[PDB]
Design a protein around this ligand. Structure first.
Ligand SMILES: CCCCCCCCCCCCCCCCCC(=O)OC[C@H](COP(=O)([O-])OCC(O)COP(=O)([O-])OC[C@@H](COC(=O)CCCCCCCCCCCCCCCCC)OC(=O)CCCCCCCCCCCCCCCCC)OC(=O)CCCCCCCCCCCCCCCCC
Ligand SMILES: CCCCCCCCCCCCCCCCCC(=O)OC[C@H](COP(=O)([O-])OCC[N+](C)(C)C)OC(=O)CCCCCCCCCCCCCCCCC
Ligand SMILES: CCCCCCCCCCCCCCCCCC(=O)OC[C@H](COP(=O)(O)OCCN)OC(=O)CCCCCCCCCCCCCCCCC
Ligand SMILES: NC(=O)C1=CN([C@@H]2O[C@H](COP(=O)(O)OP(=O)(O)OC[C@H]3O[C@@H](n4cnc5c(N)ncnc54)[C@H](OP(=O)(O)O)[C@@H]3O)[C@@H](O)[C@H]2O)C=CC1
Ligand code: SF4
Ligand code: SF4
Ligand code: SF4
Ligand code: SF4
Ligand code: SF4
Ligand SMILES: [K+]
Ligand SMILES: [Zn+2]
Lengths: 51, 114, 94, 103, 145, 102, 155, 341, 145, 207, 95, 176
C-alpha cells in the first residue's frame, strides 16, 4: 500500500478508469469484486455460506 | 410436419440466400489471395469455392440450407477480417494429404478399410 | 538477522516501520523438519455395535425431485427479502 | 491510441475440459478443477467437492470443513497477490510483484 | 453390505485342489454356494463335485484327486460368484473394466452358440457365453471357451 | 462407500479392501440429479452445473467461470479509454484463461 | 594450430550465449505461474543472466509453459520463426511435453514438438520452479557442448 | 516380411510404412524434403550427420516419437557407415557439395564417399540403394563437379548393381541454390551472362517432384537397377529463365555479356572465401551448361510423378526477394517465359 | 565500530577456506564464500555444510565433488549428483543427516549413484517389454508339392 | 442429525415449492413442469416460445427480481427427439434465491436470443452455438468463440468423438501448420465401469 | 539372471529381446538398452522356507501397514510349501 | 457486515489544505515511496544459491515415479491394475501373466511421463505400495522419448531411490 495506494501516478492510472454502474454489472453477469466495487452489497460467503 | 423456420419459408427463398452467399465468396477470393499472399490463383480459389457449394447441392430441406448459409457467412467473415491465418485458408486444399485411391483393389492392397 | 545496528536503523527509518520484529526471512521459529509420529483419531462410524449402515446411508436418502406442477391467495417470493447489511464496528471506513 | 472497439478472441487455451470430464469418474475429474483458475486451485476443488457432496447427500466432517476454509482463505491470499501485483506490473510498477511473490 | 468390518479374529484358510488344466481353484475364496455342485450334477451330468466335512470346515471338492474334465466344465467358472474357480488360460492377463465386448458367434461346431469376444488393446483376451435361450442358453462348450 | 478407507484398514479388513478396490476402479455412484453449486471464489462466483445420470461418471459438468462474464464486459468497460487504460482494465477484471476457456 | 584457436573461440561464443539467455516473455497456462516463481526472489533467474524480453527479435529461448491448443499452434510457430538464431526451445510441463491431462482432447496439440523443435523437456504438472531452473541450467550445459566452429574448421 | 515391418495404419504420422531408411546427406536442401516425406507416413529414418546437432533440429518435428534417429558419421570412417545402415532396408545417398573445401574435393564427395556407402550397404545386406547423380554428368564436362558425378555414377552401378540412380536437372525450391542464386545476383547490379544466356538451355525440376520420385522408387519394385532422369516440363533459354526470375521478384534486370574467361576470373575471386562461396568457377560452368536430353532414360512420369511447372512455384521461392512495394503481387501478374518447344 | 567487525568476518572467510586459493576456488565454483559446519561427506566427494544462523533455505548446502563417476565436475555440476540418502537432508525433508540417521540397507539398492544421464550414451531408450503376440506359420524346408 | 448425512432444510423446500406454483399460475401459457429437488433447487421447465416472456418476468417482477444470469448452458441427450436441453441459472440478490429455467430444441429449431433480457447471455449463447450447434435467433453477433477458426462440428455433442477428426502439426514442405486426419499412437482406452447391480432403488424406472 | 542373445542384446526379466533381424534394435546404437539387473524371480527363491507349528499361518509382507493385505495360508499339504500370493514368502508346517 | 474502502471527505481547514499543497508541490508521498524501496536495498535478499542450496520439501512431495520391492527383493507390484484404472491421465499401461514360478506379475508397466499429471492417485490406489512418486524432480531430458518409462526404467528408479523413498514413506504412512 505504501508503493501504490496514495501514489499519485498509481491513482492517475486507476482512478475513474473502467467505471461500471451497479445496474450494468448485474445485467452483464458480473460477480465478486466486480460487483462490490460498484457498491453492490453481495458476497456468497455471507449470503449463501458454505462449509 | 409444422416446424419453426430459421430464415427461409421454403426452398425458393433459401436458394436466394445461397446465391447471395456465392456472390460474396466469389468477389472475396481475389482479396483473400492478395491479402493472405497465397501462392494459388484466383481461378483455383474460385474453383474451390464452387466445389464447396456443389457438395451440398442435393439438399432439399430449407432449414438445413439456412444453417449451411449461416455457417458460410460465418466462414466468410472469418476470412474477410483476417481472423483466419494462412494455415486456415489453405486447409481447404489439403496439400499434405497423400492420394487415397478409391477403387476396390487399391484399398484391398493397403488394408481393411472399406 | 546479521544486519549491523546502523543498517537496521537505516532501513527502519526509510521504511518507517520496525522491520526487525516481522522479518520476511524465516529463521528458528519454524517447525522442525522431523516431527514425532501422529496418532490420528477415527470417525463416528468406528463402532462395534448400533452401527448398521442402513441407518447412516446418506446416498440412499436422496429422492427424485418433488413434482410441484406438471402438464401430464397471497403473492409469494422465493424467500424472505434479504436483510440489510450492517456497517462494520471493527473499522467502518477504510 | 483511443480504443474504438475491443473484440476478445478466446479459445486459445480451450482444452475441452468439460468433454473430458464425461469420461472420468468423479474422483478422476477432481484434478481438472485445479487447472481452471490455476491461481485459486483449492477454491476450485472446494466448489467441485460441494457439488458432488450435495448430489451424494453426504456431509464432510467438521475438521475437514475448517481445513477447507483455512486453505480457501490462504488461496484467496495467493490469488489476490497475483491479481494485484501483476495488475501493477502491467501498469508499470514491477517491484511489488517481487516482494509479494516471496510470500 | 456395510462399509466396514468388526471381525477381530483370524480367518479360515483352505487347501486348493487340482481339478484339471482349465479351472484353477483358490478355495479359500469359496463361499460354499454349491452352484458348481448343482451345475456339475444337473447340467453336465457329472456327480463328481460335492461337499466334505461339515460346519465351518465344510469344503467343496472331489474328496479324492480327480479332474473335472467334461465338455461343459468351463462353465463353472462363470457361475462361481467369486474367484474360487477361475480360468487358468486367462489367469492374470486382464481386468474386466478394460475389456471391449464384441458380441459374436461361435464356429467351433454347428450349434452357433452366441458368445462375447473380450478384447483389449487389439488382442483377444477370452471368450464368454452370451445368453440365447433358443440356442446355447448361457453355456458354451470348453472348445468354444 | 464414498471416502476410501485408511490404508491400515484396507490391509486388514475384508470390507475395507473391497471398498478401496471399488472406489479406485469403478468409483462411487452418485444418485441421479442436477445441481448448480457456487462459491465465492477469489475471482468471483465460481460454480458448476453438475448432471449425474446415476452412475460413477458425471453426465455433464458445465463450469461457470467468473472471468468468462467479466471478459465479455471488456468492450463495455473500455469505451472512451486509451490503449494503456485497456491494459489496466484487463488487470482489474483479474482474468485467468484456464477458467475462461476451460 | 587452427584446431586450438577454433576450440577456444568455441568456448567463448558458447560461454557468451549460455551466460546471456533471454527467454521470450511467452507463457500459456498454469506452468507459466511456476515460471513466474523462477523469476521471483527465491530463485532469481536474472542472477544467471536469464532475462525475459517481450519481443521475439530479442529472445534466445522460447519456454513453452503450458498447453498448446490447435487454435494457438500457428501463433506459437509464428513467434518461434521470428526469433533470430541461434534459438532454443524448452518444453515445460506435461501439456507442452506430450499433451498431458488433455492429450486425448480434440482441441489440443499432443506435444509442442509437433510444432517446433525442442531442446529440453522439463517434466511435471507443473514442474516446480526449481525443476524449471534445473532445465535451464541443463540447456546452458547443452550450449556449452556445442562445436559450431570446430565442425566448421573440419568441413 | 519381418513382422515388425509389415505396413499398418492409414499412411499417417502414427502409422507404420514398413520403410527403414538411412538417409545420408539428410541435412541439406534435398534431405529435408526426403526426410519429411518418409516421416509423414511413419517410416523409420536414420539420419547420420556430420554437422552440429543444432543444424539437425529442423528434422526433429518430421516424425512421430522414436521415428527419426540421429547418428554421427564421417565420410572416411567405413565403420561409422556400417553402424548407420546395418538395420535399414533402403539407403539413400544425398551427399554432395557445390564447392571443394580444404578437406573434401569433388572426388571425395562424389566418388569416394558414394562408393564407400554403396560398398558397406551391399556387404550389410541392404536391399535397396538410391543414389543421386546429375542430369548433366559427363566425363568430358568442363566442370569438375559434373566429371566426378559421371565417375561416381559408374562406381555406384558397379558396387551396387541393383541401385536406383536418379539424375535430376537443376532443382528449384525454397532453399535451392538456383532461383535463389539468380535472385541474389541483384546485389551486384547487372546480371552477367556468358553469351548473354542465349546459348544455354535449362529444364529445371521442382524439389517436391524429385522428392516424390525418390519415394516412389523405394516402393516400386520395377525401379531396382534402373537409371532415371528427373526433368521439369519445360525447357528455357538461360536468358529467358533469369529474366523471368527478376520479373517474378520485381527487380530491375540489366543483363550484360561477359565472356567465359572473364566469368571464370571472377569465379576464382569468390572462391577465396573460407566459408560458403557465393559463386565459383565450377558453379559458373554448370549454370551455363545445356541440360542434356536423354530420351532413352525413364523419367518422373515413369514413377507416377507429374512434373510441376516452374510457373506455378516461382513465386513461392521468389516472393521473399521483393521489396515491400511488390511483396503482395500475385502469381498471375508476371507473364511467363518463352518455352523452347 | 561494527564496520570494522564486518571486515574481520569477511577477512576470516579467507582463512576459513584454507587461504586465498581455497577461497577463490569456492568463489568461482559456487559463487558463495560462506563458511559452514561440515555435516558430512558422501562417497563421491560431495561435502555438506550447515549454518543454522542463516535463514531457512540458505542454512544447508553442498559443495559438489570435482569428479563423479569418471566425469569432470569442477565447473559442470548439477543437482542430480546428490545421492538419495543426502537428498532428503539437503531438501529439508528430514532434520537428521545420513551420518546420524543412516538409511536402511537393502541388497538391491544401488551402491553407486548416477546423475542425470540424458544426452549421453548411457541415456534411457524406451522399448516394449512384452514378447511377440502372434506366432506366424513357418513353411517347410522341402518341396513336397 | 446423523454426522455423515447432509441435513434437510424443509423451510427452503416449502418456500421454493410455493414460488414454483406461483410462477406456474402467472405464466400458464409457457410452463410445462415445476419441480424442487431434495437439496432445494427449483426448476421451471417451459416451452421454448416462452424464453423471453418467462425470463423477462423473472428479472423484472417485484416478487422475483432475478437480476443476475449466473449461467446459461446446454445438455445433449441423443435419445430425445429434441436432444438439446437449454438451462438458465438465475440469481436473485433481493431474495437471496436461485432458480433454474429449462427448455429444449433440436438441431434445426432456433431459440430466441435472451440478450435483450441479460447482456451476460451474449457469450453464453455463442458458446452453446459453438459447442452444440444450437442457433439463437436475433443474436447481435453469433459465431464460434472457443473452437479453432474453421473448425467443423460441435464437440460437446455426445456423438462427437473425444479426440475429434483432425489434428495439427508443422509441415516443413509447405512451411505452415497443417490439419490431417487424426491418428493416435495410443488409442484412448474405453473403460466399462458400471456395476451390473442397481445402486439407488428410489430412482428405479418402471419396467 | 540377465542373459544375452546370440546377437549380444541383454534379455530382460520379462524375456524380451529383439530378434536377429528386427530393425527396432537400431534405437540402441550409440546408446544402451535399459535392463534392471536384480531379477525378482531369482531374489525371492533365495529366501528360506519358514517353519511354523500351526496348520494356518498369516502373512502381511512385514512392516505392518507398510506390507501387503494380510492373508492366511493353509499348510495341510506336505508335498509342497504354502506361498504368500502377495510377497512370495514360503511357509511349511514342521512335522 | 461491510466497510467502505474509499469514502472519506478531506478536511478543508487551512492547515490541512496547506499540507496537501506541500504534498502536491514537494512530492512528499512520492518521496515516501522512495523510502520503501530504499529499505529493501539494505535487506538481505531472499535468493538461495541453487544448485548448491535447495528449496525445502516435505515427505509428501510428488516427483518421479518408482517401482518398489519387498525387503527380500521381490517386486511389490502384483499387477492388480488399480493404478491404471484410477490414473486421471491414462498414463499407465500394464500387461501381466503368470510368472515362471506362478507369481502374478507384470510383463509391461509403462508410465507416459508426458501424459502424467503427477497427481499421486496411483500411489493412493496401490494396495501394496508398489508404485510411488519419489522425491526426485531433476530429471529433465533432451528428447521426448526419454520420458516414456517402461518397467525396466521404473524398477531402476526404485533401486536407485529406495533409500530415500522408504524413509519418506516411514515419515508419512501414519497420515495415510
Ligand atoms: C564505488 C563504491 C565502492 C568502493 C568503496 C568500497 C569500500 C569497501 C567495501 C567493503 C565491503 C565489504 C563488506 C564485507 O566486509 O564483507 C563482509 C562479509 C562477511 O560479513 P557477513 O557475515 O556477510 O555480515 C554482513 C552484515 O552482517 C550484513 O550486511 P550490512 O548491511 O549490515 O553491511 C555491513 C557494512 C558493509 O558495508 C561496507 O563494509 C562497505 C561500506 C562502503 C560504503 C560505500 C557506499 O555496512 C555497514 O556496516 C554500514 C556502514 C556502511 C555505509 C552504509 C551507508 C549506506 C548508504 C546510505 C543510505 C543512502 C544511500 C544514498 O564478507 C564478504 O562477503 C566479502 C565479500 C566481498 C565483496 C566485495 C567487497 C568489495 C566491493 C568492491 C570494492 C571496490 C572495487
Ligand atoms: C572478450 C574476451 C572476454 C573473456 C571472457 C572470459 C570468460 C570467463 C569464463 O569463462 O568464466 C569462467 C568459466 C566458468 O565455468 P562455467 O560457466 O562452466 O560454470 C558453471 C556455473 N557454476 C560455476 C556456477 C557452476 O570457466 C569456464 O567454464 C571455461 C570457459 C572458457 C571461455 C573461453 C575463454 C577463451
Ligand atoms: C523570494 C520568493 C521566492 C519565489 C520563488 C519561490 C518558489 C518556490 C515555491 C514554489 C514551489 C516550488 C516547488 C515546485 C516544484 C514543481 C512542482 C510540480 O510541478 O509538481 C506538481 C505536479 C502536479 O501534478 P499532480 O500532483 O498530479 O496534480 C496537479 C493537478 N493539476 O506533480 C508532479 O510533478 C509529480 C512528478 C511525478 C514524477 C516524479 C518521479 C520522480 C520523483 C522523485 C524525484 C525526487 C526529487 C529529486 C530532485 C533532484 C534534483 C537534483
Ligand atoms: N540443384 C541441386 O540441388 C541438385 C542436386 N543434386 C544432388 O543432390 C544431392 C543433394 O543435393 P543438395 O541437398 O542440394 O546438396 P546440399 O549441399 O544441399 O546438402 C548436401 C548434403 O551433403 C552433406 N555433405 C556434404 N559434404 C559432405 C561431406 N564431406 N561429408 C559428409 N556429408 C557431407 C551435407 O551435410 P552438411 O549439412 O554437414 O554440409 C548435406 O547434408 C547432391 O548429391 C547433389 O549433387 C543433383 C542435381 C541437382
Ligand atoms: S460355485 Fe464357487 S463359491 Fe460356489 S460352492 Fe462352487 S467354488 Fe464355492
Ligand atoms: S474379487 Fe471377489 S472373490 Fe476375489 S477376493 Fe475380492 S471379494 Fe473375494
Ligand atoms: S502441465 Fe500441468 S501445470 Fe502445466 S499447463 Fe498443463 S495442466 Fe497446467
Ligand atoms: S501421478 Fe496421477 S497422472 Fe501420474 S501416473 Fe499416477 S495416477 Fe496417473
Ligand atoms: S503398481 Fe500397485 S496398483 Fe499398480 S498394478 Fe501394481 S500392485 Fe496394482
Ligand atoms: K468365478
Ligand atoms: Zn506376504
Amino acid at each position: 500500500e505504501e508503493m501504490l495506494t496514495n501514489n499519485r501516478i498509481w491513482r492517475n492510472r486507476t482512478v475513474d478508469i473502467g467505471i461500471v454502474t451497479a445496474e450494468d454489472a448485474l445485467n452483464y453477469g458480473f460477480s465478486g469484486v466486480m460487483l462490490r466495487g460498484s457498491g453492490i452489497q453481495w458476497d456468497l460467503r455471507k449470503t449463501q455460506p458454505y462449509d | 410436419t409444422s416446424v419453426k423456420p430459421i430464415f427461409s419459408r421454403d426452398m425458393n427463398e433459401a436458394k436466394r440466400r445461397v446465391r447471395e452467399l456465392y456472390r460474396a465468396w466469389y468477389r472475396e477470393v481475389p482479396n483473400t489471395v492478395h491479402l493472405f499472399q497465397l501462392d494459388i490463383s484466383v481461378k483455383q480459389g474460385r474453383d474451390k469455392v464452387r466445389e464447396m457449394f456443389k457438395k451440398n447441392a442435393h439438399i432439399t430441406d430449407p432449414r438445413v440450407v439456412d444453417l449451411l448459409v449461416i455457417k458460410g457467412k460465418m466462414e466468410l467473415e472469418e476470412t474477410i477480417k483476417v481472423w483466419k491465418q494462412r494455415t486456415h485458408v489453405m486447409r481447404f486444399f489439403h496439400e499434405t494429404e497423400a492420394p487415397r485411391p478409391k477403387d476396390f483393389l487399391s484399398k484391398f492392397y493397403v488394408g481393411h478399410d472399406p | 538477522a546479521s544486519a549491523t545496528r546502523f543498517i537496521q536503523w537505516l532501513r527502519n527509518w526509510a521504511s518507517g516501520r520496525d522491520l526487525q520484529a516481522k522479518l520476511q526471512l524465516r529463521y528458528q521459529e519454524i517447525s522442525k523438519r522431523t516431527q514425532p509420529p501422529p496418532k490420528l483419531p477415527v470417525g463416528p462410524s468406528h463402532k462395534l455395535s448400533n452401527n448398521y449402515y442402513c441407518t447412516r446411508d446418506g446416498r440412499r436418502e436422496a429422492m427424485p425431485p418433488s413434482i410441484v406442477m406438471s402438464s401430464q391467495k397471497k403473492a409469494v417470493s422465493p424467500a424472505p427479502p434479504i436483510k440489510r447489511w450492517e456497517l462494520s464496528q471493527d473499522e467502518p471506513y477504510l | 491510441e483511443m480504443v474504438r472497439k475491443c473484440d476478445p478472441h478466446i479459445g486459445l487455451l480451450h482444452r475441452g475440459t468439460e468433454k473430458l470430464i464425461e469420461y472420468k469418474t468423479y474422483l478422476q475429474a477432481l484434478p481438472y478443477f485445479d487447472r481452471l483458475d490455476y491461481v485459486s486451485m483449492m477454491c476450485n476443488e472446494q466448489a467441485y467437492s460441494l457439488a458432488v457432496e450435495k448430489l451424494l447427500n453426504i456431509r464432510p466432517p467438521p475438521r475437514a470443513q475448517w481445513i477447507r476454509v483455512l486453505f480457501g482463505e490462504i488461496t484467496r491470499l495467493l490469488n489476490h497477490i497475483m491479481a494485484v501485483t501483476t495488475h501493477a506490473l502491467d501498469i508499470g510498477a514491477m517491484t511489488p510483484f517481487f516482494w509479494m511473490f516471496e510470500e | 453390505g456395510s462399509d466396514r468390518s468388526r471381525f477381530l479374529e483370524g480367518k479360515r484358510a483352505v487347501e486348493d485342489k487340482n481339478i484339471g488344466p482349465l479351472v484353477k481353484t483358490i478355495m479359500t475364496r469359496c463361499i460354499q454356494c454349491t452352484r458348481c455342485i448343482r451345475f456339475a450334477s444337473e447340467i453336465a451330468g457329472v456327480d463328481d463335485l460335492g461337499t466334505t466335512g461339515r460346519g465351518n470346515d465344510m469344503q467343496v471338492g472331489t474328496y479324492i484327486e480327480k479332474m473335472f474334465m467334461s465338455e461343459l466344465s468351463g462353465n463353472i467358472i462363470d457361475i462361481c460368484p467369486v474367484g474360487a474357480l477361475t480360468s487358468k488360460p486367462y489367469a492374470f492377463t486382464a481386468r474386466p473394466w478394460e475389456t471391449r465386448k464384441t458380441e459374436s458367434i461361435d464356429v467351433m461346431d454347428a450349434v452357433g452358440s452366441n458368445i462375447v469376444v473380450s478384447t483389449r488393446t487389439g488382442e483377444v483376451m477370452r471368450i464368454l457365453p452370451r445368453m440365447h435361450e433358443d440356442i446355447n442358453e448361457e453355456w458354451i462348450s470348453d472348445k468354444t471357451r | 462407500k464414498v471416502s476410501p478407507p485408511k490404508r491400515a484398514e484396507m490391509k486388514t479388513s475384508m470390507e475395507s479392501l473391497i471398498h478401496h478396490f471399488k472406489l479406485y476402479t469403478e468409483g462411487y455412484q452418485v444418485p441421479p440429479g442436477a445441481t448448480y453449486t457456487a462459491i465465492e471464489a477469489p475471482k468471483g462466483e465460481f460454480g458448476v452445473y453438475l448432471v449425474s445420470d446415476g452412475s460413477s461418471r458425471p453426465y455433464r459438468c458445465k463450469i461457470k467461470a467468473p472471468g468468462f462474464a467479466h471478459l465479455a464486459g471488456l468492450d463495455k468497460m473500455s469505451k472512451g479509454h486509451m490503449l494503456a487504460d485497456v491494459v489496466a482494465i484487463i488487470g482489474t477484471q483479474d482474468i485467468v484463461f484456464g477458467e475462461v476457456d476451460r | 594450430r587452427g584446431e586450438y584457436v577454433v576450440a577456444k573461440l568455441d568456448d567463448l561464443i558458447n560461454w557468451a550465449r549460455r551466460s546471456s539467455l533471454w527467454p521470450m516473455t511467452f507463457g500459456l497456462a498454469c506452468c507459466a505461474v511456476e515460471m513466474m516463481h523462477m523469476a521471483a526472489p527465491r530463485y532469481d533467474m536474472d542472477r544467471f543472466g536469464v532475462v525475459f524480453r517481450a519481443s521475439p527479435r530479442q529472445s534466445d529461448v522460447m519456454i513453452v509453459a503450458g498447453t498448446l491448443t490447435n487454435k494457438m499452434a500457428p501463433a506459437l510457430r509464428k513467434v518461434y520463426d521470428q526469433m533470430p538464431e541461434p534459438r532454443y526451445v524448452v518444453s515445460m510441463g506435461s501439456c507442452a511435453n506430450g499433451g498431458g491431462y488433455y492429450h486425448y482432447s480434440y482441441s489440443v496439440v499432443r506435444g509442442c514438438d509437433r510444432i517446433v523443435p525442442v531442446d529440453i523437456y522439463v517434466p511435471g504438472c507443473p514442474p516446480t520452479a526449481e525443476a524449471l531452473l534445473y532445465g535451464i541450467l541443463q540447456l546452458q550445459k547443452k550450449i556449452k557442448r556445442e562445436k559450431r566452429l570446430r565442425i566448421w574448421y573440419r568441413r | 516380411l519381418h513382422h515388425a515391418v509389415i505396413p499398418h495404419g492409414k499412411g499417417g504420422r502414427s502409422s507404420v510404412s514398413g520403410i527403414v531408411a538411412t538417409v545420408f546427406g539428410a541435412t541439406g536442401f534435398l534431405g529435408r524434403y526426403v526426410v519429411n516425406h518418409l516421416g509423414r507416413m511413419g517410416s523409420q529414418v536414420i539420419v547420420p550427420h556430420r554437422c552440429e546437432p543444432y543444424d539437425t533440429m529442423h528434422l526433429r518435428p518430421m516424425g512421430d516419437l522414436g521415428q527419426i534417429i540421429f547418428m554421427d558419421w564421417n565420410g572416411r570412417d567405413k565403420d561409422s557407415i556400417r553402424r548407420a545402415v546395418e538395420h535399414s532396408s533402403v539407403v539413400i545417398n544425398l551427399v554432395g557439395r557445390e564447392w571443394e573445401t580444404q578437406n573434401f574435393d569433388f572426388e571425395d564427395v562424389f566418388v569416394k564417399i558414394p562408393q564407400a556407402i554403396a560398398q558397406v550397404s551391399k556387404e550389410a545386406g541392404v536391399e535397396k540403394f538410391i543414389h543421386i547423380s546429375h542430369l548433366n554428368a559427363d566425363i568430358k564436362s568442363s566442370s569438375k563437379y559434373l566429371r566426378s558425378k559421371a565417375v561416381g555414377e559408374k562406381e555406384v552401378r558397379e558396387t551396387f548393381p541393383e541401385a536406383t540412380i536418379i539424375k535430376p536437372a537443376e532443382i528449384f525450391g525454397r532453399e535451392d541454390r538456383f532461383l535463389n542464386y539468380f535472385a541474389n545476383i541483384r546485389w551486384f547490379g547487372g546480371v552477367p551472362l556468358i553469351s548473354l544466356g542465349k546459348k544455354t538451355v535449362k529444364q529445371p525440376v521442382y524439389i517436391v517432384d524429385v522428392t516424390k520420385g525418390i519415394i516412389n522408387a523405394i516402393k516400386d519394385p520395377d525401379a531396382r537397377g534402373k537409371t532415371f532422369a528427373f526433368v521439369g516440363p519445360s525447357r528455357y533459354l538461360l536468358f529467358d529463365l533469369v529474366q523471368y526470375v527478376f520479373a517474378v521478384a520485381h527487380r530491375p534486370f540489366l543483363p550484360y555479356p561477359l565472356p567465359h574467361f572473364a566469368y571464370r576470373w571472377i569465379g576464382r575471386l569468390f572462391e577465396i572465401s573460407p566459408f560458403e562461396p557465393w559463386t565459383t568457377r565450377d558453379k559458373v560452368e554448370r549454370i551455363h551448361t545445356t541440360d542434356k536430353i536423354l530420351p532413352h532414360l525413364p523419367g518422373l512420369e515413369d514413377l507416377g510423378v507429374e512434373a510441376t511447372p516452374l510457373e506455378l512455384k516461382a513465386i513461392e521461392v521468389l516472393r521473399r526477394h521483393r521489396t515491400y512495394r511488390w511483396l503482395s503481387s500475385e502469381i498471375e501478374d508476371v507473364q511467363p517465359a518463352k518455352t523452347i518447344p | 565500530m561494527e564496520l570494522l567487525q564486518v571486515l574481520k568476518r569477511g577477512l576470516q572467510q579467507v582463512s576459513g577456506h584454507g587461504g586465498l586459493r581455497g577461497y577463490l576456488r569456492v568463489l568461482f565454483r559456487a559463487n558463495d564464500v560462506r563458511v559452514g559446519t561440515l555435516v558430512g561427506e558422501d562417497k563421491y566427494g560431495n561435502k555438506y555444510y550447515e549454518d543454522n544462523k542463516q535463514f531457512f533455505g540458505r542454512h544447508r548446502w553442498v559443495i559438489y565433488t570435482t569428479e563423479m563417476n569418471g566425469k569432470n565436475t569442477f565447473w559442470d555440476v548439477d543437482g542430480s549428483m546428490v545421492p538419495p540418502e543426502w537428498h532428503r537432508w539437503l531438501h529439508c525433508m528430514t532434520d537428521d543427516p545420513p551420518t546420524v540417521k543412516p538409511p536402511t540397507a537393502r541388497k538391491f539398492i544401488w551402491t553407486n549413484h548416477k546423475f542425470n544421464l540424458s544426452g549421453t550414451p548411457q541415456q534411457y531408450v524406451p522399448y516394449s517389454t512384452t514378447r511377440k503376440k502372434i506366432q506366424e506359420w513357418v513353411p517347410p524346408s522341402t518341396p513336397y508339392k | 442429525t446423523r454426522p455423515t448425512v447432509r441435513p434437510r432444510n424443509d423451510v427452503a423446500h416449502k418456500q421454493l415449492s410455493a414460488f414454483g406454483e406461483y410462477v406456474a399460475e402467472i405464466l400458464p401459457k409457457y410452463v410445462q413442469q415445476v419441480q424442487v429437488s431434495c437439496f432445494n433447487e427449483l426448476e421451471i421447465c417451459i416451452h421454448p416460445d416462452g424464453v423471453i416472456p418467462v425470463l423477462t418476468f423473472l428479472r423484472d417482477h417485484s416478487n422475483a427480481q432475478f437480476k443476475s444470469l449466473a449461467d446459461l448452458t446446454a445438455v445433449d441427450i441423443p435419445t430425445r427427439q429434441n436432444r438439446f436441453e437449454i438451462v438458465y441459472n438465475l440469481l436473485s440478490l433481493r431474495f437471496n434465491s436461485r432458480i433454474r429455467v429449462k427448455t429444449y430444441t433440436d438441431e434445426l429449431t432456433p431459440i430466441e436470443s435472451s440478450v435483450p433480457v441479460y447482456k451476460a447471455a451474449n457469450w453464453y449463447e455463442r458458446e452453446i452455438w459453438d459447442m452444440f450447434g444450437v442457433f439463437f435467433a436475433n443474436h447481435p453477433d453469433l459465431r464460434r468463440i472457443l473452437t479453432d477458426y474453421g473448425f467443423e462440428g460441435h464437440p460437446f455433442r455426445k456423438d462427437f468423438p473425444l479426440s475429434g477428426y483432425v489434428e495439427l502439426r508443422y509441415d516443413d514442405e509447405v512451411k505452415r501448420v497443417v490439419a490431417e486426419p487424426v491418428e493416435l499412437a495410443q488409442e484412448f482406452r474405453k473403460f466399462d465401469l458400471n456395476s451390473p447391480w442397481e445402486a439407488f432403488p428410489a430412482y428405479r424406472q418402471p419396467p | 539372471g540377465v542373459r544375452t542373445s546370440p546377437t549380444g542384446e541383454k534379455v530382460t526379466h520379462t524375456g524380451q529381446v529383439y530378434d536377429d533381424g528386427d530393425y527396432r534394435k537400431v534405437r540402441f546404437v550409440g546408446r544402451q538398452k535399459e535392463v534392471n539387473e536384480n531379477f525378482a524371480i531369482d531374489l525371492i527363491a533365495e529366501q528360506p522356507v519358514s517353519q511354523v507349528g500351526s496348520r494356518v499361518i498369516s502373512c502381511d509382507g512385514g512392516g505392518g501397514a507398510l506390507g501387503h493385505p494380510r492373508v492366511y495360508i493353509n499348510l495341510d499339504k506336505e508335498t509342497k510349501t504354502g506361498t504368500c500370493g502377495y510377497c512370495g514368502l514360503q511357509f511349511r508346517q514342521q512335522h | 457486515t461491510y466497510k467502505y474502502v474509499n469514502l472519506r471527505e478531506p478536511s478543508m481547514d487551512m492547515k490541512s489544505v496547506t499540507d496537501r499543497a506541500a504534498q502536491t508541490l514537494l512530492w512528499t508521498e512520492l518521496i515516501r515511496g522512495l523510502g520503501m524501496t530504499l529499505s529493501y536495498l539494505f535487506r538481505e535478499p531472499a535468493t538461495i544459491n541453487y544448485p548448491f542450496e535447495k528449496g525445502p520439501l516435505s515427505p509428501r512431495f510428488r516427483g518421479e515415479h518408482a517401482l518398489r520391492r519387498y525387503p527380500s527383493g521381490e517386486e511389490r507390484c502384483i499387477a492388480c491394475k488399480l493404478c491404471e484404472a484410477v490414473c486421471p491421465a491414462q498414463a499407465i499401461t500394464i500387461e501381466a501373466e503368470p510368472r515362471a514360478d506362478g507369481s502374478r506379475r507384470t510383463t509391461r508397466y509403462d508410465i507416459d511421463m508426458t501424459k502424467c499429471i503427477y497427481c499421486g492417485f496411483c500411489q493412493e490406489a496401490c494396495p501394496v505400495d508398489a508404485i510411488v512418486e519419489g522425491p526426485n524432480f531433476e530429471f529433465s531430458t533432451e528428447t521426448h522419448e526419454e520420458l516414456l518409462y517402461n518397467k525396466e526404467k521404473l524398477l531402476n528408479n526404485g533401486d536407485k531411490w529406495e533409500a530415500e523413498i522408504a524413509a519418506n514413506i516411514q515419515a508419512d504412512y501414519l497420515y495415510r
